[PDB]
Swiss-Prot record:
Catalyzes 2 different reactions between oxygen and the acireductone 1,2-dihydroxy-3-keto-5-methylthiopentene (DHK-MTPene) depending upon the metal bound in the active site. Fe-containing acireductone dioxygenase (Fe-ARD) produces formate and 2-keto-4-methylthiobutyrate (KMTB), the alpha-ketoacid precursor of methionine in the methionine recycle pathway. Ni-containing acireductone dioxygenase (Ni-ARD) produces methylthiopropionate, carbon monoxide and formate, and does not lie on the methionine recycle pathway. Also down-regulates cell migration mediated by MMP14. Belongs to the acireductone dioxygenase (ARD) family. It catalyses: 1,2-dihydroxy-5-(methylsulfanyl)pent-1-en-3-one + O2 = 4-methylsulfanyl-2-oxobutanoate + formate + 2 H(+); 1,2-dihydroxy-5-(methylsulfanyl)pent-1-en-3-one + O2 = 3-(methylsulfanyl)propanoate + CO + formate + 2 H(+). It comes from Mus musculus (Mouse). It is an enzyme of class 1 (oxidoreductase). It holds the Pfam family ARD. This is Acireductone dioxygenase. Binds either 1 Fe or Ni cation per monomer. Iron-binding promotes an acireductone dioxygenase reaction producing 2-keto-4-methylthiobutyrate, while nickel-binding promotes an acireductone dioxygenase reaction producing 3-(methylsulfanyl)propanoate.
Length: 179
């Protein structure tokens, strides 16, 4: 089962689990109140999976590619890794389906406290436009992820503060409507 938790107060070593003590787990239902949605798939089948196709058609995920984050293969690795972990938002959904390996997507809750989401092979997530978030590898230091997009992609991050954007305003309005 996909795991998420409130983070501790240490600012060192982003790749460690950083579980708050005592444990404060976060449920998929609480994540939905933040607009964060999740599906579980068989990642071995990703090249030809009717279940993935059902989600892509439902959600209008008409575009995809594959990215591999590995200290060796990935160009500008050190710079990209730093960028990924900077708190930012996008004006579009951020949709990621983990094909191999694992990593952490952190999101702000309604009180602007960090929640860490542990994503592993088979896990698919969408972070809504406007949500403040960041990504890091975990201590296994490897992930292969499918990126999906509603139409032709724009990857631009806006590092916090980015509060003026319509996407952020609309997201804040969405938050008023959930539990
Ligand atoms: Ni992002």
């Amino acid at each position: 089962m996909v795991q998420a938790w409130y983070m501790d107060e240490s600012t060192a070593d982003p790749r460690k689990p950083h579980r708050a003590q005592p444990d404060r787990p976060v449920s998929l239902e609480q994540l939905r109140t933040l607009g964060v949605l999740y599906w579980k798939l068989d990642a071995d089948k990703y090249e030809n999976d009717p279940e993935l196709e059902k989600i892509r058609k439902m959600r209008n995920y008409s575009w995809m590619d594959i990215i591999t984050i590995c200290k060796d293969t990935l160009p500008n690795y050190e710079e990209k890794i730093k960028m990924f972990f900077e708190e930012h938002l996008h004006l579009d959904e951020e949709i990621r389906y983990i094909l191999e390996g694992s990593g952490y997507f952190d999101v702000r809750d309604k009180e602007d406290k960090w929640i860490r989401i542990s994503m592993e092979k088979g896990d698919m997530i969408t972070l809504p436009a406007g949500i403040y978030h960041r990504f890091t590898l975990d201590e296994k230091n490897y992930v292969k992820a499918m990126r999906l997009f509603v139409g032709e992609p724009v990857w631009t991050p806006y590092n916090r503060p980015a509060d003026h954007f319509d996407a952020r305003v609309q997201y804040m309005s969405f938050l008023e409507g959930t539990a």
